[PDB]
Amino acid sequence: PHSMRYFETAVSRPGLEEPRYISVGYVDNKEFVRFDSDAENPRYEPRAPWMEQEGPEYWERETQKAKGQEQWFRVSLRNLLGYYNQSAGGSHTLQQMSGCDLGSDWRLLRGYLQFAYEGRDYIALNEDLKTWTAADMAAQITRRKWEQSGAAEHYKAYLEGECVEWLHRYLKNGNATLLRTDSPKAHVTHHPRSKGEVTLRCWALGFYPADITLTWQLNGEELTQDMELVETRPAGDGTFQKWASVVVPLGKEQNYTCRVYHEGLPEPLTLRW
């Protein structure tokens, strides 16, 4: 299973002159290129070691694509002010997500192309890559305009062609870096507490990718309501961390078991205190 994404953003701010445009590319959810208009010599920069294979002709072209998108966002931002009857002197955001999903047969599984204004969904290309979805009354002007121009055919071509073909190319070029999954190393810690109770905190550390599930069991059935957890969080080194806890009678603690479900594991982990 594989994917590519470009996550594009432009933000305007009161008083300033031109919006700031940032684009970020991801292969299999890991960052691999970046462009940022604030930089001294704005360019698409490599963002993993495996991308340094790519020659000068590659960066030059990608860089001109970015400058083009910058101009596209500029104008779009301007039109949006108009559509929403927003005056001057505020801050606005326009974001885009696009890319493609491949199954393990390396064939195109799904295409994505969606837009948000002020962090709210504005318009998106449906799964069929032929029809558009736009909720806001203000978005209808765009959707009619786009329906009558064959915008969807343009995007369809990209998503079915270059997206796929170039993801293919990238995947071959970085086999040793992007085929890894680090398994979690788990453990349970003991925190004494009020009223003859204790907190059992189940840790999972050094794992990649980030998706993971931790469940507590009272000798069999799970405990959904009484549980406490944290949002999965980066360690800073490329791996991730997460815990989940439940409150338990002192002494009567061994009939609680913690289960860790991660990808990259031979089978779910099972731990107690």
């Binding site: 684009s23 990608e62 694509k65 970015a66 083009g68 104008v75 779009s76 326009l94 915008a151 170039w166």
Partner: peptide, 9 residues
């Protein structure tokens, strides 16, 4: 490979 957009919003 970066997408390039069609018509502005």
């Amino acid at each position: 490979k970066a997408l390039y957009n069609y018509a502005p919003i």
